[PDB]
Design a binder for this molecule. Structure first.
Ligand SMILES: CCCCCCCCCCCC(=O)N[C@@H](Cc1ccc(O)cc1)C(=O)O
Length: 188
């Protein structure tokens, strides 16, 4: 599916779609040597979470979720709590984008995060509709430079993320003026 492609990005609602989303995350993280923790699944079946999916002609190949700052906090809190405390004091709506995974076997890849562009648009629209102030991410240092181009400013140092047993930096983006934080906005 690359010369007659059909890519569908939508909210995952059916229990079997969410199981399949968890399966992609599980396989992807095991291949990259990340640990799978049951805390992420907990957050996702909670009220303040939303899972998106990416379909190659009806088979799911990619997924991304977003967790809203509620009474259960954010997964970031175990590592980057005090980096968020200032914003929480000012009464800022925060949300963490989480469990982003693509299965490279199910999509004719570039041989790459920019092939999840439609998943990102869905996260961005959600953030502009929910009236979210700061969109937070904790990412593997290898994609650090990519998300910096996307306009995410570094808010946390390079630490060890115990949940994943892998290194992480924290980045955040001010959604209400996202176009002023990204270089790609010069081309529109
Ligand atoms: C303008 C709108 C932009 C939308 C872009 C959203 C970017 C999402 C990145 C999510 C990173 C991720 O999956 N972290 C892992 C946590 C993790 C795993 C391994 C590491 O080495 C470090 C961190 C997760 O949440 O599972």
């Amino acid at each position: 599916g690359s010369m007659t492609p059909r890519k569908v990005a939508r909210i995952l609602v059916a229990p079997n779609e969410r199981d399949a989303a968890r399966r992609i995350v599980r396989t992807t993280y095991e291949a990259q040597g990340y640990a799978i923790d049951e805390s992420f699944a907990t957050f996702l079946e909670g009220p303040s979470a939303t899972t998106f999916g990416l379909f190659n002609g009806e088979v799911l190949y990619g997924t991304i979720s977003i967790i809203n700052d509620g009474a259960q906090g954010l997964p970031m809190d175990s590592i980057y709590a005090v980096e968020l405390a200032a914003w929480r004091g000012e009464g800022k709506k925060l949300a963490e984008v989480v469990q982003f995974a693509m299965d490279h076997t199910l999509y004719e890849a570039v041989a790459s995060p920019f092939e999840a562009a439609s998943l990102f648009t869905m996260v961005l629209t959600y953030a502009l509709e929910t009236h979210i102030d700061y969109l937070c991410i904790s990412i593997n240092p290898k994609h650090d430079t990519f998300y910096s181009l996307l306009g995410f400013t570094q808010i946390g140092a390079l630490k060890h993320y115990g949940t994943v047993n892998a290194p992480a930096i924290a980045r955040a983006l001010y959604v209400p003026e996202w176009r002023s934080q990204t270089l790609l906005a010069q081309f529109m």
